[PDB]
Ligand binder design. Sequence first.
Ligand SMILES: *C(=O)[C@@H](NC(=O)[C@H](NC(=O)N1CCN(CC)C(=O)C1=O)c1ccc(O)cc1)[C@@H]1N[C@@H](C(=O)O)C(=C)CS1
Length: 324
Amino acid sequence: ALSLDQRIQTLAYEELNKAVEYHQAKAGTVVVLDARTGEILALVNTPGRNRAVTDMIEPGSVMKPFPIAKALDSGKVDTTDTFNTLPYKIGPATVQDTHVYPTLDVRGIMQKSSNVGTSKLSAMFTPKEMYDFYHDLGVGVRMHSGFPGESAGVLRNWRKWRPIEQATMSFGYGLQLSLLQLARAYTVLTHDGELLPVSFEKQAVAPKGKRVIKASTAKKVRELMVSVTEAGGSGIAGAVDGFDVGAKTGTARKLVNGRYVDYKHVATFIGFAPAKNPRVIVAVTIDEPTANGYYSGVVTGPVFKQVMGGSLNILGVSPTKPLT
Ligand SMILES: *C(=O)[C@@H](NC(=O)[C@H](NC(=O)N1CCN(CC)C(=O)C1=O)c1ccc(O)cc1)[C@@H]1N[C@@H](C(=O)O)C(=C)CS1
């Protein structure tokens, strides 16, 4: 039997189509995973190929929780640590944020989405260490989900990395994942530090996870990611009434004949709820919105809000706090 919940599939389809039409976007995808089994509860694309599984994107800012997790898991970084977040150069390349802060602690790096801050956490590790971590999340790895034409994505071998590449990969450029691989990677945060396999068949046996970080680290990162959907966070549009939601926003410039252009974006929103003990992961991407905004929060946040809130109601999960 399929693991797909037709009520969630219908909800995802309606909300995705409403957003793609409203933002006059080229395409989009929604994935809903069971946060503790890796079963696919919903998987919808705009008409055409199964982009969720066939197409690879640069994850951009939705990659940031992973270097943050690795830094905390190493014991080299504490959540309360502060970093110099001023723009800086690696040879002729600039690493910078859209909004400059001289310093941010780890919660601020997550809340505000600091490329600089994330890069300073990656830079404490060797290229081999960071490659091994990305490989352990499934980047560049076949999921064997059961879909044909499944992308493995791209993870360049660390032996070829220029120092600028380690930095940009930490904030999601210079490596590529499908949306299904990115939703899968988030099971490291939801399943107490173990990466789950993904499947669209109902599970009969407990999936065997692979340990990537400590359960204590996963719990701390989920707490940090709630800041994204609260006041001051980039993902406040994705807040769900009656729950705490851990999430990450990303807006990525697209690559046109090897150059990043400022008039073409991919908007991504990924999150999980209830934040402290999540039941589901919801991943949304909308390709080239052209009307009514282009930022993750405004384009994909509302899709995430409706799909996550609707999914929790369908699965019979009670709100953990009074509604407002
Ligand atoms: C996360 O997604 C962040 N997005 C960016 O920083 C965007 N940056 C890029 O597209 N970008 C392209 C390629 N390179 C060289 C490898 C870069 O260094 C690079 O940064 C971005 C910046 C400005 C824009 O106007 C649009 C996109 C952060 N995400 C958002 C968000 O969630 O939407 C933010 C709250 C802050 S930037």
